Amino acid sequence: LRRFSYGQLAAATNSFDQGNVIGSSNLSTVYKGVLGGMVVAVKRLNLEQFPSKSDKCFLTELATLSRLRHKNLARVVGYAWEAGKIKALVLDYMVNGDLDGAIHPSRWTVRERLRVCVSVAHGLVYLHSGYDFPVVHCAVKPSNVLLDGDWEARVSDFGTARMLGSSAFRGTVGYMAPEFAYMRTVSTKVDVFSFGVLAMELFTGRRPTGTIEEDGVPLTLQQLVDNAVSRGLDGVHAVLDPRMKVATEADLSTAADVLAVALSCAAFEPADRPDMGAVLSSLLKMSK
Numbered sequence: 001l002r003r004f005s006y007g008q009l010a011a012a013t014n015s016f017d018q019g020n021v022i023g024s025s026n027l028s029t030v031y032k033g034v035l036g037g038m039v040v041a042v043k044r045l046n047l048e049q050f051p052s053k054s055d056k057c058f059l060t061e062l063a064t065l066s067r068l069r070h071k072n073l074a075r076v077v078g079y080a081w082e083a084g085k086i087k088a089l090v091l092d093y094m095v096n097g098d099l100d101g102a103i104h105p106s107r108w109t110v111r112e113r114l115r116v117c118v119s120v121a122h123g124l125v126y127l128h129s130g131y132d133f134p135v136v137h138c139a140v141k142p143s144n145v146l147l148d149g150d151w152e153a154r155v156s157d158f159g160t161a162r163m164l165g166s167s168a169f170r171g172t173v174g175y176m177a178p179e180f181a182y183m184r185t186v187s188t189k190v191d192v193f194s195f196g197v198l199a200m201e202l203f204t205g206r207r208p209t210g211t212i213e214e215d216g217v218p219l220t221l222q223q224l225v226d227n228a229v230s231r232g233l234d235g236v237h238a239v240l241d242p243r244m245k246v247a248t249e250a251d252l253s254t255a256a257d258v259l260a261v262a263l264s265c266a267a268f269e270p271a272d273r274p275d276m277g278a279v280l281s282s283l284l285k286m287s288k
């Protein structure tokens with residue numbers, strides 16, 4: 001875990017040039033950087049506008065990510081920490097962007113999307129039980145899944161992690177377990193829920209925003225998928241991502257099986273949700 005200066009990160013990011021921006025939110029800007037010539041991502045918190053959650057998310061990401069390692073997790077290289085000037089994480093650069101960009105001939109066949117689910121599941125199994133204490137990520141969603149030079153998925157963005165010991169929901173709310181969104185309850189099951197929603201979006205191509213139908217009742221992504229799965233393989237086909245090739249029985253059957261797993265993950269009651277271990281198990285049977 002190297003500590004970097006402002007000047008070092010300024011130089012690496014070409015003076016934080018707009019053309020090096022590879023990612024943005026209200027709370028941070030992520031820059032491509034080059035330090036032995038190692039390519040990195042520099043996640044720079046927005047200290048000027050949002051000092052106190054910049055601090056919370058900075059320290060959370062730094063404390064959490066510096067203790068963890070796994071092939072399906074983002075990797076921290078170092079940080080810069082100069083109050084009032086810069087707080088930044090220096091991360092392994094992931095050349096193929098994030099899963100949100102990948103979702104919204106194509107490489108993203110049913111098998112390749114199943115592979116991403118498996119990879120993310122490995123990351124989440126490690127978070128929940130591979131370290132000395134369970135780490136709950138709390139923001140599982142496609143924009144927090146990055147892609148390798150080998151298109152291997154990596155769980156990223158630990159700014160909301162906790163260590164234990166038109167639309168229907170806009171922005172990121174559609175990914176959140178109800179007990180997490182409404183009461184900030186944190187358990188490993190909140191990540192199981194979000195993983196279910198991620199998998200649904202990955203195979204339908206639909207953000208989990210949902211829709212207010214015209215009686216004013218919201219149709220969640222989960223309910224859309226539940227209705228399709230209940231209508232059999234032909235129902236599932238109707239709801240799958242139109243940009244995804246679904247030609248063989250095997251590809252449709254595999255996608256149907258993922259959505260059935262995703263529906264169990266997104267159960268309303270936390271106790272009805274499987275653990276990530278059983279989720280991984282189901283997905284590993286489906287990669288055979």
Ligand SMILES: Nc1ncnc2c1ncn2[C@@H]1O[C@H](COP(=O)(O)OP(=O)(O)OP(=O)(O)O)[C@@H](O)[C@H]1O
Nearest residue numbers: 022023024025028030041091092093094098143157
């Ligand atoms: N290591 C990395 N390599 C390449 N791109 C990255 C990396 N980390 C982040 N990005 C890009 O930056 C975007 C946002 O970064 P990140 O999610 O870490 O912080 P955030 O924007 O504050 O979180 P959120 O978007 O959930 O509010 C990602 O969607 C991704 O496209």
Ligand SMILES: [Mg+2]
Nearest residue numbers: 139157159160
């Ligand atoms: Mg974040």
